[PDB]
């Protein structure tokens, strides 16, 4: 199928409380596989999935050094941004970076990414062409001019098209048991009386992977989007996700209502009813 690799980085300054907190995590699709945290006692990048543990001490050495370098780069970058935005040295500020690549079924690059944010807003992004920049403001435009002179887009392109894709392919293979397995939702409908006149029908989807799913309620076939309470897809803590959709139904009219589940791990799309 189609897959993705991402590295997320967050630096948070803390004036008067030492150097900024740096936390980076790596993902393949919806699976966390590496992490580094600067406030751990002797920080190293650590595995978080079984298929990455097989990498040699030299992988972990290099990964760790890259993480330390990025933390340090971020510390300086955070000082720089106080200048660009004419800010006081008093407050806490946040620098975020994401980069990675998407591959298709064949394992060819579909799209590469590299983007930064300052204080939770867009700062600068590498465009889909992997050759030009979108700067969100005049401060980011100063970064753009420096990165244009230093030919940074060309360096990111070389990586996003080469190593990112090659190592993602490698991880998909080594992690083929899990990364290439979709777990279908386990589904049921529950009935929650509100009064003698109404009850809540709640349609559960549990234990699914990857996170992407569609839950909708129908009444007689028509769509109840306007009346459906749909909670955010949430992690179960074991690699799988949960979600539910709920409608308030007139007591006795429960069998007019059908819940519909689509998810890639299902042999066929599901249709469910409250089963008293």
């Amino acid at each position: 199928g189609s897959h993705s690799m991402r590295y997320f980085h967050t630096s948070v300054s803390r004036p008067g409380r030492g150097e900024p907190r740096f936390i980076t995590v790596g993902y393949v699709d919806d699976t966390l596989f590496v992490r580094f945290d600067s406030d751990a006692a002797s920080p190293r990048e650590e595995p978080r999935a079984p298929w990455i543990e097989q990498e040699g001490p030299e992988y972990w050495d290099r990964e760790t050094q890259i993480c330390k370098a990025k933390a340090q780069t971020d510390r300086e970058d955070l000082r720089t941004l106080l200048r660009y935005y004419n800010q006081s040295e008093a407050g806490s500020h946040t620098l975020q970076n994401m980069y990675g690549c998407d591959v298709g079924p064949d394992g060819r690059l579909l799209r590469g990414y590299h983007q930064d944010a300052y204080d939770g807003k867009d700062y600068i992004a590498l465009n889909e062409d992997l050759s030009s920049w979108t700067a969100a403001d005049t401060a980011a435009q100063i970064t753009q001019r420096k990165w244009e002179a230093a030919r940074v887009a060309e360096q990111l392109r070389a990586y996003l098209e080469g190593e990112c894709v090659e190592w993602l392919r490698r991880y998909l293979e080594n992690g083929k048991e899990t990364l290439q397995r979709a777990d279908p939702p386990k589904t049921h409908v529950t009935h929650h009386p509100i009064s003698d006149h109404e009850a809540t029908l709640r349609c559960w989807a549990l234990g699914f992977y990857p996170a992407e799913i569609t839950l909708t309620w129908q009444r007689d076939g028509e769509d109840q989007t306007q009346d459906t309470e749909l909670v955010e897809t949430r992690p179960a803590g074991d690699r799988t996700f949960q979600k539910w959709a709920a409608v308030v139904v007139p007591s006795g009219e429960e069998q007019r209502y059908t819940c519909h589940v689509q998810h890639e791990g299902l042999p066929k799309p599901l249709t469910l009813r409250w089963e008293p």
Partner: peptide, 9 residues
Amino acid sequence: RRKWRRWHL
């Protein structure tokens, strides 16, 4: 694996 990052804002 990661990309080394060799530029500043």
